[PDB]
């Protein structure tokens, strides 16, 4: 018997995205809400998300990426001449873009079963992860210096992030003085350690400009 996604379940999803926006806590929700849903049902939820067109652009292309990938590892038989039982699900089919609700349900209840509903879901999750990333605050603790990156370039980036940080003036001090040195590559770090704990920024740059 077919039971489509309940309007209540679909409505809760709206309020979730409405409140939680795109914090990392949304994903767990999405999973709980989308448990056992068909590729069609998932799409309903996705299309139910108003606004946030930016994040959506990502989700979309991400879907397309995974779908295209699927076709490579599963080229089954393009053009099933002479009928048999049931055609194999292509990427676009899993995504539900080119598959009827019946076909989807069919693939899920066949021997062996092809859980297209779950497969598509996984792809959506990956897309959601990417979205959360671009929405997550820039942590200065991850700004390291590349082994070939000019010291000046590193400084520009380091300070840029600093300008966009929520921390007390005291903590910022530690970052400017100590941290900047800590994340420098082995060579520059070796030169900075020669100047001592109190060298000025200008001095450091002049020392590592080679």
């Amino acid at each position, epitope marked *: 018997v077919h039971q489509a996604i309940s309007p209540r379940t679909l409505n809760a999803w709206v309020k979730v995205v409405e409140e939680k926006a795109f914090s990392p806590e949304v994903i767990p929700m999405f999973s709980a809400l989308s448990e056992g849903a068909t590729p069609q049902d998932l799409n309903t939820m996705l299309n139910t998300v108003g606004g946030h067109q930016a994040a959506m652009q990502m989700l979309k292309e991400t879907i397309n990426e995974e779908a295209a990938e699927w076709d490579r590892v599963h080229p089954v038989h393009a053009g099933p001449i002479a009928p048999g039982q049931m055609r194999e699900p292509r990427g676009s089919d899993i995504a539900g873009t080119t598959s009827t609700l019946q076909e989807q349900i069919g693939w899920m209840t066949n021997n062996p079963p092809i859980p297209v509903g779950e497969i598509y879901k996984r792809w959506i999750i990956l897309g959601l992860n990417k979205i959360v990333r671009m929405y997550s605050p820039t942590s200065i603790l991850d700004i390291r210096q590349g082994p070939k990156e000019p010291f000046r370039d590193y400084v520009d980036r380091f300070y840029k992030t600093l300008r966009a940080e929520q921390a007390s003036q005291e903590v910022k001090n530690w970052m400017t003085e100590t941290l900047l040195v800590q994340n420098a590559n082995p060579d520059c770090k070796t030169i900075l350690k020669a100047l001592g704990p109190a060298a000025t920024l200008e001095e450091m740059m002049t*020392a590592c400009q080679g």
Partner: antibody, heavy 120, light 106 residues
């Protein structure tokens, strides 16, 4: 013309304190660090420590901890070195030097010196 | 930690003689600096990064060495070269050497 004009000679009671000065000129005070050196006859040249004009951070030589205290005044481009709990052992000439950064620190600029005499 | 011991402690050279003073560090150091000081005056930067001469320093001067042993040499000693020479750790904590008093042999 980068110049460092140090304060005059000092005379203070044993156990007291004193604060020397060094007025910098001809360069951006906050862009460089300021170091201090002690000179006693028979043990010439000992590094005391240095101050970062802008951040106000001071790093001292373990030996002179709880003895020396560096400060800087951006507005008057002057660095102050304060000595406390004086003994005849501290009577000496105190210099200040601003380095030039090349492959590392190069102490190219030194002050004329200030002779401190610990006596009552 | 690092201690710079210079030797000889005091020596007198005759005008024209080739002089060579050394500096021994307790542990390896990348570079070494050299300063010249005369009675009643601020020490003057003489040699940077082991062998680079400072401004106004006579060509007769030269430096060399690596790791734990460094040296300063005067090809032809001259009157104006009499003074005290100190060596210095190129990096923090910028420790100074014990010094060497160079005099004139008459």
């Amino acid at each position: 013309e980068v110049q460092l004009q140090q304060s005059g000679a000092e005379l203070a009671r044993p156990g007291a304190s004193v604060k020397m000065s060094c007025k910098a000129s001809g360069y951006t005070f906050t862009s460089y660090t300021m170091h201090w050196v002690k000179q006693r006859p028979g043990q010439g040249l000992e590094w005391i420590g240095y101050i970062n004009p802008s951040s106000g951070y001071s790093n001292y030589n373990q030996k002179f901890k709880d003895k020396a205290t560096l400060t800087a005044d951006k507005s008057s481009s002057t660095a102050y070195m304060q000595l406390s709990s004086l003994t005849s052992e501290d009577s000496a000439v105190y210099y200040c030097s601003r380095p030039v950064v090349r492959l590392g620190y190069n102490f190219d600029y030194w002050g004329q010196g200030s002779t401190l005499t610990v006596s009552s | 930690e690092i201690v710079l011991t210079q030797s000889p402690a005091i020596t007198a050279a005759s005008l024209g003689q080739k002089v060579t003073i050394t500096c021994s560090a307790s542990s390896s150091v990348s570079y070494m600096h050299w300063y010249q000081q005369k009675s009643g005056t601020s020490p003057k930067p003489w040699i940077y990064e082991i062998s680079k001469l400072a401004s106004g320093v006579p060509a007769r001067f030269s430096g060399s060495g690596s790791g734990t042993s460094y040296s300063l040499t005067i090809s032809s000693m001259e009157a104006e070269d009499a003074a005290i020479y100190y060596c210095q750790q190129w990096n923090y904590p910028f420790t100074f050497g014990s010094g060497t008093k160079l005099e004139i042999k008459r």
